[PDB]
Amino acid sequence: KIFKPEELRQALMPTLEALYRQDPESLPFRQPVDPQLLGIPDYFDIVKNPMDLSTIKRKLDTGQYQEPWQYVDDVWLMFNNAWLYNRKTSRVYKFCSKLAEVFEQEIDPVMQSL
Length: 114
Ligand SMILES: CCOc1ccc(C(C)=O)cc1NC(=O)c1ccc(OCCN2CC=NCC2)c(C(=O)OC)c1
Known about the structure:
It is found in: Cytoplasm; Nucleus. It comes from Homo sapiens. The structure is a monomer. 65% of the residues lie in helices and 0% in strands. It contains six helices and no strands. Helix 1 packs antiparallel against helix 4, helix 1 packs antiparallel against helix 6 (91-113) and helix 5 (68-85) runs antiparallel to helix 6 (91-113). The longest helix is centred in the C-terminal third of the chain and has 23 residues, at 91-113. It is globular, with a radius of gyration of 14 Å. It starts with a helix and ends with a helix. The site of the ligand CCOc1ccc(C(C)=O)cc1NC(=O)c1ccc(OCCN2CC=NCC2)c(C(=O)OC)c1 has 11 residues, from helix 5.
């Protein structure tokens, strides 16, 4: 099956917007982690493949995904980076867990429809 870029955008962008809409939980994920600004210079020593909502959105807008599972992989890369880097008591870690719950719920019916 070939998935056209606009088909993927129409189906998958609403699932990304569902993550963006989460407040407070999406706020640390709306832009790439800037380790200098945030005062966490060890970040890139631990997270080798950074990912965030704005990068995923740009990839959808520029047709960088051929298959739905590639989009899902990037969302999960974002989650796994945050669970890897952050302590389990931290805001970012617990916010990540909430976003993963939202995403699981949103992506399932969409995948059925694709
Ligand atoms: C200090 C440690 O922070 C982090 C550590 C790890 C990670 C990840 C993904 O692993 C992320 C962060 N945090 C951030 O990236 C971050 C970035 C910007 C934020 O807000 C943006 C601005 N707005 C809020 C203030 N006024 C208006 C506009 C936030 C935030 O607000 O989270 C609650 C977090």
